[PDB]
Amino acid sequence: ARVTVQDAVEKIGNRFDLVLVAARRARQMQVGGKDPLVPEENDKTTVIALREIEEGLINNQILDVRERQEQQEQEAAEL
Amino acid sequence: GGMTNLERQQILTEEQYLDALEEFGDEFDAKMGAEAIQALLKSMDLEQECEQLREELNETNSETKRKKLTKRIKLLEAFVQSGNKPEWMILTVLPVLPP
């Protein structure tokens, strides 16, 4: 588990945008088919998303770039 | 009631109504109840009364009367700018709530 989110707040910069970014990533992992970028240790989606944010692996720009890449690849594959 | 002997807002009583009925046959209408108030509200012209109140406010000089006049000019302009009408304050049809 975890007790403080100070590192994630420092990396994102705002305490209100961190919630939205973490919710977006956690919803991607939970209801979508995505898999964590960090080794999950009996953790839930929200804590996994926070631990990914803490290490500089997830932010708004990364999520947008990956979504655009996924959309382009899907539209190319469907042909 | 015309500009002959009685004003358009004068209040009468039973004996006074009988006297006025004996005095004037035609051009004289007196009513009581909400129908009278609805007739008063419906025959009122808003633009002309607005102009009259504006000139009476800007010409004469006072402070309390000036506030009293500007307290009514604002209401008249609020009624004119919106789509409401003066006589809609008198209910003719009454809504009833869903059971």
């Binding site: 919803r27 939970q30 209801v31 | 209910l91 009454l94 809504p95 009833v96 709530l97 869903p98």
Partner: protein, 48 residues
């Protein structure tokens, strides 16, 4: 959790389905307020 009649069932179905997401909707006690205000002869309405 309190009042939106069509959102309570959707939230319950989503929680049982393992998806934690809500469709907010509109509370059912503001429609009552509108119906009680407009039964006084006052035309209140949502627009646009």
């Amino acid at each position: 959790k309190s009042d939106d009649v069509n959102g309570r069932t959707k939230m319950y179905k989503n929680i049982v389905d393992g998806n934690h997401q809500m469709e907010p909707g509109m509370p059912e006690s503001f429609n009552v307020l509108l119906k009680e205000i407009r039964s006084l002869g006052i035309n209140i309405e949502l627009e646009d």
